[PDB]
Amino acid sequence: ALPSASEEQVAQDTEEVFRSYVFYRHQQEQEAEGVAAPADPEMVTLPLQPSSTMGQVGRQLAIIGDDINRRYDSEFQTMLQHLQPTAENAYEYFTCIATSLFESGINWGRVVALLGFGYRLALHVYQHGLTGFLGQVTRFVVDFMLHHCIARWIAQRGGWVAALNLGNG
């Protein structure tokens, strides 16, 4: 695409890179285990658009955060069960862990870790019985990212197109 980017186009590439990443991450985890597996390969699958350059952004971010993700993952669900949040206070708990994580500062490792622990959380309600939460989590994070001035920083870092200019690029 073209260089430079505003906060108006960052909210669109943020939502597209948020699912394209959790998808390629659960797709490979399905071969090893089936924990929090998807609804089987059918119409209820996740139809992403890999025809765009953002398709390669999720694949890369899913590689630099592969081992660091499993390192502290068995403890994320263990404490998540002791939480037992609700649809009325779902943003009151998630906004707490995040603000408690970036409280020290902001880095590429703190963004991938956020999405990593931003999946099972939503799916945890889907199974519970609250069908129709995926649209809620989307129209919730994008608002937190634009309210916490996260979109700007990403714009100063070169937008999401700066991912190709990282380690494995």
């Binding site: 390192r71 502290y72 068995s74 403890e75 404490m79 009151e92 862990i97 408690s100 490792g109």
Partner: protein, 76 residues
């Protein structure tokens, strides 16, 4: 013995404790030299959330060991 705790800011702080020390004591030492309330501490070792009713020998932590530190805040 001496242990090394790693934070999410890239800062590592040393700590002098003993295998018979309880997890509640090590947390008090961190707030005494750092000021971080024990209610907002999520130690992590081997992908296991150590409990507050067990000692360090319970997990088999030797000397020169490293433990990650997360955070759950107390306001929310």
């Amino acid at each position: 013995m001496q242990i090394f705790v790693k934070t999410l800011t890239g800062k590592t702080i040393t700590l002098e404790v003993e295998p018979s020390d309880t997890i509640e004591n090590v947390k008090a030492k961190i707030q005494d030299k750092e000021g971080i309330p024990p209610d907002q501490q999520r130690l992590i070792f081997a992908g296991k959330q150590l409990e507050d009713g067990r000692t360090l020998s319970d997990y088999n932590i030797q000397k020169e060991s490293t433990l990650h530190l997360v955070l759950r805040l107390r306001g929310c």
